[PDB]
Symmetry: C3
Subunit: 331 residues, 3 copies
Amino acid sequence: KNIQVVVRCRPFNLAERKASAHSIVECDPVRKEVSVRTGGLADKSSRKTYTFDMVFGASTKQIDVYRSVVCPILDEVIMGYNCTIFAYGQTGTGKTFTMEGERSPNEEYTWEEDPLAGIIPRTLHQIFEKLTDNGTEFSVKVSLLEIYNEELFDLLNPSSDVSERLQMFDDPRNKRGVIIKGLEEITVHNKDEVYQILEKGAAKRTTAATLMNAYSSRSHSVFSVTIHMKETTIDGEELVKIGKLNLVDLAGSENQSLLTLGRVITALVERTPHVPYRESKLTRILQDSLGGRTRTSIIATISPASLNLEETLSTLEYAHRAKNILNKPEV
Amino acid sequence: KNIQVVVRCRPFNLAERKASAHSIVECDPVRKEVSVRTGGLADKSSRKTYTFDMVFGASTKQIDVYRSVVCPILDEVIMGYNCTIFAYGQTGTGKTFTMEGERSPNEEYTWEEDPLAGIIPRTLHQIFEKLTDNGTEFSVKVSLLEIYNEELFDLLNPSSDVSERLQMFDDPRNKRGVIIKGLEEITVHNKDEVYQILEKGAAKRTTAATLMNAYSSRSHSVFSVTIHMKETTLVKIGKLNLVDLAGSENQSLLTLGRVITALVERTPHVPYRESKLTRILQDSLGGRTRTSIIATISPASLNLEETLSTLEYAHRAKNILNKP
Amino acid sequence: NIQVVVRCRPFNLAERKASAHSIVECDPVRKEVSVRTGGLADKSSRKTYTFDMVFGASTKQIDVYRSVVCPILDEVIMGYNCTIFAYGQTGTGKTFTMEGERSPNEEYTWEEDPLAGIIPRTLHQIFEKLTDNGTEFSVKVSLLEIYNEELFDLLNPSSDVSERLQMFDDPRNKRGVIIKGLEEITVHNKDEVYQILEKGAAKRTTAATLMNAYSSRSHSVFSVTIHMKETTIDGEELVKIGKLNLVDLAGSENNQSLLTLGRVITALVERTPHVPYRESKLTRILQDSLGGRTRTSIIATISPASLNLEETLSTLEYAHRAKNILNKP
Ligand SMILES: Nc1ncnc2c1ncn2[C@@H]1O[C@H](COP(=O)(O)OP(=O)(O)O)[C@@H](O)[C@H]1O
Ligand SMILES: Nc1ncnc2c1ncn2[C@@H]1O[C@H](COP(=O)(O)OP(=O)(O)O)[C@@H](O)[C@H]1O
Ligand SMILES: Nc1ncnc2c1ncn2[C@@H]1O[C@H](COP(=O)(O)OP(=O)(O)O)[C@@H](O)[C@H]1O
Ligand SMILES: CC[C@@H](C)C(SC[C@H](N)C(=O)O)(c1ccccc1)c1ccccc1
Ligand SMILES: CC[C@@H](C)C(SC[C@H](N)C(=O)O)(c1ccccc1)c1ccccc1
Ligand SMILES: CC[C@@H](C)C(SC[C@H](N)C(=O)O)(c1ccccc1)c1ccccc1
Ligand SMILES: [Mg+2]
Ligand SMILES: [Mg+2]
Ligand SMILES: [Mg+2]
């Protein structure tokens, strides 16, 4: 089962518009193609075109990404599978906008109806809508860690100092798994507890950014939600499903974890014997998502601007080749 | 004939004066010498002294540079020769001031009379003065591209996005020439069309500085004027490249140094092809083009090592033969 | 042998803003520094170091002076060459320790100012100890800085702080060098001290304006030389000369003089035959006063904050490698 790769192009921002930026990206959602204009002033006709599993153009809204991509993934998680979605792309292209979102100003929407909310809050909101009172006895727990300079910080930890570090070990019970020693896993009892948790998480990250150089662009963010489901069959049997969803917002593609991820992906695509998972914190964490039994999706984010031609091409090639990686989703 | 090399030292700026900066540079126009005080507090007798084709001290005004250096060169160009002037030196020493200049404030002067105007505007002006007054039919075309990170941008292009990139290909009908694919070459019908053209180019550069890290200090700027003169007994074509190099303090600058060394040592394979700048400049160097270098320096003690680096770098270039 | 002490500064505003946790516990009595090393993963992990002395966040400037400098100033007065270094990451209190700071307004005189560091106190005390002692004596000072292996003279009459010194072997002293161009100012009485220091600090301020990350990369070498005369019953003279070098090193975080100094301390300490003095401007300058004949002290400054774990451990390992003291029980 191949890793699914989608592309999301953001709209122009104000600074690009003030610089009279030209578009070099055309997205065709129906053909699922992205075509980029590569020849600038010299060669008006040259393009590079790629087919992906889905393509989202500049007008795609947060809700569109959720309906197209996330909903199907979540339903699989609820069936008791493990799934991973990660965002890959240049700093400034919308990785964080996509994975987390933002709050619209003034207080003019609830967090659950905010059009700027991204994948994490919609996912948590939906977990509760989908399972609450639908018979399922169920629990939800969340964690949020960040990797920076191969050190591990805990955004949800009750410790008031964000710099207190985690430690990673192999998990003796799960052959591709790790244990994040010290990681705070918060039980979310109902959706009315969701916002405050995320909010405190974001406030610790804000502090971290004042502490460490180029923090948000160099950091990888790893959000995980685990759903324990217990049901009761008409026969009398008690049956337990456990689903886990990893939501990952990588460092800007433009560095050991980012570097090792590339080497890991390259080794998977070229079927080379040794896959260097152990050489970074990120790839140890993602081992099961990258040639394990976790179902993995990639969202490659790009800018439409001519200025960014080179990184836009690099992102598309990187993402396109990852469509060849096969996982064995199973639970 | 040898590549001509001159030196221009700028006056102290206000931050230097506030830092109580001492001069370590003495320029002697008559001996054509630059003498640098090198011993600091330790040895008051140490100097490095260099002889150049011309030396311009702190008090030199834009018009002196134009009259002394460019007038003779522009004569050559009008006679159908190709010429190239490039400024080399540390960021902050006056490479752009010299090649382009600046606008005095409050519209005090027309652009033709502005004391701060540099080589490019004075040249375009004088081309029209000299030839209009000549009688012969002539046309004038200009282009302005910049090299940043080995990418080529067109400052005069009608395209509204300065980031749209040019490409470079070998010129099939010239062994040392290149064609800049996409390059806007604007016909200048009258000197009253000059300022707006340069003005828009500069506005596009301003946008570019905004988009790319340390743009103006790392960019090389290539301004070219071409004059077609209909003579009988004929078309005479004169081309003048006016080049404002990246700060000397990076593939193109790197390769230029290697090219210059290879030309100095008289080695076989000058690596012109290993950077955009040297491919563009190939024909200039060890081509028929007559080349002048204007080496720019600061007078301040603080900048000692870079000042010596510039002087040494430029001085050796005097031994290179043009061949035009 | 080398004396090694550790000084931990107090939390600063930004660290409190960011709710910083301490990972450093200092015990002056036991001369121990205990570092909390396990963050979130292991609450019980601790690394413990033992030094000649340990000063905690509350330690006053004058106490650092009394306990560290005085014994050393006595040796100098007896005509020997001594050096005191401050070592540690930028921001931990090296310059605070070596020079101190000037309390706002003028609530105290420089001699009384509780923020004054080792340099001003040392000068003040030299005159006290010798001015009521008897003896005829002479005091001169120099303050130079090493930046990118370039040498700048902070007390020089030259108005341009960028005029560079040069360094040569002292033909009459194989372990010494001549700092060509160096301004040695005679300080006649204590009422001349402050303006000299103040002119030097003003030169440095200008330098930091000229050169990238100047104060964090520079080594600062302040030198006091004392000439002391005594006549014999027959009118012959015997001068004894003492020298004190107060050295505020470049930040240890993550240049050439810095690594060389390390190799020289390492070589002096594990006692290797050839000491690498020649290799840097800093160790050539200080060779005279190093070797073990004379008292040498390193004040390793650290931060208490969790954020700085790795650099604090690194500073501590450095200090520990300079004089290995074993933990007690
Ligand atoms: N799809 C989008 N629609 C509108 N604005 C976007 C979109 N994606 C990103 N942005 C905006 O672009 C800027 C950078 O996005 P961000 O999420 O920080 O990117 P990254 O995480 O890749 O650095 C932010 O101001 C964000 O609001
Ligand atoms: N010959 C000169 N006379 C007066 N001012 C000058 C001179 N050369 C340079 N300057 C000033 O010095 C500063 C830096 O000049 P600039 O041309 O930007 O140097 P560079 O292009 O070599 O970085 C500018 O403010 C400019 O006005
Ligand atoms: N022991 C201390 N007590 C109070 N403040 C201190 C102490 N040590 C350092 N500081 C403060 O920390 C900051 C940095 O100290 P500084 O001497 O500049 O460190 P360094 O020279 O090692 O970079 C200054 O604001 C200083 O006042
Ligand atoms: C205050 C808005 C927070 C709570 C945010 S966006 C955080 C932003 N991307 C940042 O980097 O600070 C969120 C949560 C729900 C709805 C909208 C936004 C959020 C979403 C996921 C995880 C943490 C915060
Ligand atoms: C507004 C003054 C422009 C038109 C300038 S100076 C541009 C400046 N060095 C910059 O980097 O922006 C000029 C043109 C004529 C007379 C004086 C200045 C000019 C000179 C040569 C090429 C382009 C601009
Ligand atoms: C105005 C206070 C000066 C004179 C200072 S502290 C300089 C400060 N550390 C800096 O880096 O600028 C000093 C001198 C005496 C008493 C208190 C401070 C001093 C101490 C030693 C050497 C030079 C200055
Ligand atoms: Mg981001
Ligand atoms: Mg310039
Ligand atoms: Mg300091």
